[PDB]
Write a protein that binds this ligand. Sequence first.
Ligand SMILES: [Ca+2]
Length: 270
Amino acid sequence: KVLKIRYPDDGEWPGAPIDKDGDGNPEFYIEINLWNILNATGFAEMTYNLTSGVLHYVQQLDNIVLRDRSNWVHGYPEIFYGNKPWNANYATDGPIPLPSKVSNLTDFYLTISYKLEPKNGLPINFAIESWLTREAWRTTGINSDEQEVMIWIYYDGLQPAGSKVKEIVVPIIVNGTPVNATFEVWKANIGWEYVAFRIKTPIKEGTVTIPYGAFISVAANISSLPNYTELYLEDVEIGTEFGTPSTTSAHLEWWITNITLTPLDRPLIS
Ligand SMILES: [Ca+2]
């Protein structure tokens, strides 16, 4: 009834599938993913109650030393659907067939219900991301002719990599009300092409629906990559990047109660 993963008890890379029907194909996959922490005191723990579908993350880290300061953030505790291309973890029990080529995929709404509670001014975002790869089922990382796309619906004290390109409007739904929101578009080259959409009005808690293709279409349009529409949208990851090279203590709690992907009858890219 309750799935729990914990750092450092379960090792430096705790993770587990959510597979409510026990059929061997996870609906989602969770990782604590403190990918840039070399050492810290304290703990991080993620629990999923299968019996309510609440995911609850609790982190209390101190004495943090990073693997590589140039990577800026400390980690990205997360839940994801599809194939995460950095490792052998996946979740494909859902209505959207990921991975799929972007030229073949339908648009979809992504709806998330959540609440964030960073403590003491910790820099954080709440960021949705996808990786776009040349192969269908990548498990060994990311090359220079591929893309990372992020959508930050909350932030405090973090800036995306690279430089600001533009602002766009995206129709979204916030707490049941359709609203026109503005996102800054940022682009970087960090070993691969990075495009981030940072909302200008951060949303710290509630229920938010976004149309995924509004973001992928812009990321395609601004891309310097050849043959963009032949890339595969590998996954949809949801989590909180946190920390900066100056941050030595990072206390954070958050909850996600629902993630739903809803197919639309229209192409992803327009
Ligand atoms: Ca399953």
